[PDB]
């Protein structure tokens, strides 16, 4: 009875919540993003087992807005869904105050809109990790500095310097941390950024991956647009992890 | 107002005045009548600047919305259909004369007429605004289709002069705006510098001979310019 709606257990968990971080679990789909000094990658798992299926077609990272790059992770449907909200809440912000949707916002308000879902009864929290990434610009100069936010299920909204989602999140969060120790993480360039993120999909899921096995988000203080990154690009990633 | 979409082969090039008027005093001296809905899709705005800048700001959010979703380009059509939907719902309430001219992969180089009504008219070239009357007749005569985007974009000025030289509402600077295959190329003729004015036109120097002094003799002379004389 406390399990199959939004109310509290004796012990004050919302069951139904943390029964939505299983879903983000449960694909064992893995993204990994990483802000460096002047932009943030988003690394996404991109499996298709399938031969038939077209590649394509099934992403993982859509574009919210021009210059906010999502990456779901969960029910790829409930995803596909809260980038419509995303969408829906960036388009309504764009017109009422005439700029674009600061990222920090955008983030903060799927918050809210993820929390309502374990507030009324009958609705299903949406089993997803949405991890919002792009520039945005700092009021004291006018740079664009890079920026992830992820919303989770229970309505969490958090800035990240990198981040996890998925099926390893424990064991790629674990290879970043220590990883953390080492550099700086924030006085890194795009490239280097980049190998530690990818090294962190490989250690976690425990395989060498290929250009075609991930798909790759990209913002640039140079190029602030939320780009896929093409397989060419990641390859001379992929061979530069192996090598070091 | 004076506006002009004209297409040539790759694109288009829209022309604008920059005055707004309230009547006879001007309240805006260079304001913007090329209003961006996406990159390479502006439209031009005659009529009640509240009521356009609402409507090409409403249908620029949808277009970006849809530009978003798609995950492609927005063809030309597609703005100048929302924005006859637009026009078109409140057609009693507003005062709005728009032309959507744009370039998308698809068609090339488009160009819509919509004016009060929500009619919605694709065309080679499309005249909106006070100032529209006047060049009509200067179209028919040398207008030339096939033009190079380098001449289109120098007619157009000329002709946004024309018809600001002669229309009150319109006049100041002459903005045009480029949309082809290449980055938009705006450019702003400052009056100073405009291709056409009747103030520098050689026909207009002579003045009228109203004044003309005391005589005795019909032999009109010219207009009396000393009280010695």
Redesign the interface.
Known sequence: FDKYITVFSPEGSLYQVEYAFKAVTYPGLLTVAIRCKDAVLVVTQHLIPDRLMRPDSVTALY????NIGCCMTGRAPDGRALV?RA?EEA?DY??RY?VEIPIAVLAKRMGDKAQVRTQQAGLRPMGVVSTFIGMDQSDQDGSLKPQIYTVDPAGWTGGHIACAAGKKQVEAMAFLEKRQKSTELDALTQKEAAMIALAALQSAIGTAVKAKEVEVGRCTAANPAFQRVPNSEVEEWLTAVAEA | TTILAVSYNGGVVLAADSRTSSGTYVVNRASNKLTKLTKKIYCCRSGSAADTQALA??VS?YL??YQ??I?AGVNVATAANLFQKMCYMNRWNISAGIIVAGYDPINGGSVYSIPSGGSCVKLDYALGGSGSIFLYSFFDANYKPGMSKSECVAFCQRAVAHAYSRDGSSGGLIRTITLDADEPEDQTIPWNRSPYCMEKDPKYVTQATQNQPFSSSAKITGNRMSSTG
Do not use: A, L, W
């Open positions: 574009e919210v807005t021009p419509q969408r388009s764009q017109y005439g | 700001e409403r959010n970006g919305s978003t979703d995950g």
